[model samples]
Each structure stands twice: as C-alpha cells, then as structure tokens.
Target: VGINVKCKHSGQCLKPCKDAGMRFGKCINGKCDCTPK
Candidate 1:
C-alpha cells in the first residue's frame, strides 16, 4: 500500500513500507511514499 500518508522523515516511514513489502520508503512533500520492488 504505497499510499500518500503523512510523514516527518524516512526513519519514521521506512519501516511501515518495509513491513508492507515495499522496496523503498521516502519522504516527499511531507508524505510517506513507498516504491515497490
């Protein structure tokens, strides 16, 4: 679920995406965005 969720930083965003099976997690425009493998 690579949703455009709110985020303060990658540290806070990475794990959720990681657990959700995303290859990468990033903070963009204050959102937690995920990239699929």
Candidate 2:
C-alpha cells in the first residue's frame, strides 16, 4: 500500500483506489498508469 502498485486508470477514474489513498494516475500511449497523489 506504501509502494507504487499497478493501477489501471486515471486519478479521477481510479475510484476504488481513491478511497485507499492519494493516487497519481496517468495515461501513456493508448494505455493508462496509476499512483498516489
């Protein structure tokens, strides 16, 4: 939970993870990335 886990959406789209903690989600190419904010 402290480390950068593999997410599958944007910061706003990452609803589930949002409740977990700050998430810094991004999109690269046609795919997407995620993290804490």
Clashes of each: 0, 6
Which candidate ranks first by TM-score, i.e. highest? 1
Q: Which portions of model 2 show Cα errors greater than 4 Å? A: 1-22
Write the residue-wise lDDT of candidate 2 on 1-37 in tens digits.
2323444445433543455554744544434344565
Write the residue-wise lDDT of candidate 1 on 1-37 in tens digits: 3565677887556777887778667887887888768
Name the TM-score of candidate 2: 0.30
**Candidate 1: which stretches are off by over 4 Å?**
none
Q: For model 1, what is the error of residue 10's alpha carbon versus the real structure, in angstroms, after optimal superposition?
A: 1.2
Candidate closest to the true structure, highest lDDT? 1
Ten contiguous residues minimizing lDDT sum, candidate 2? 1-10
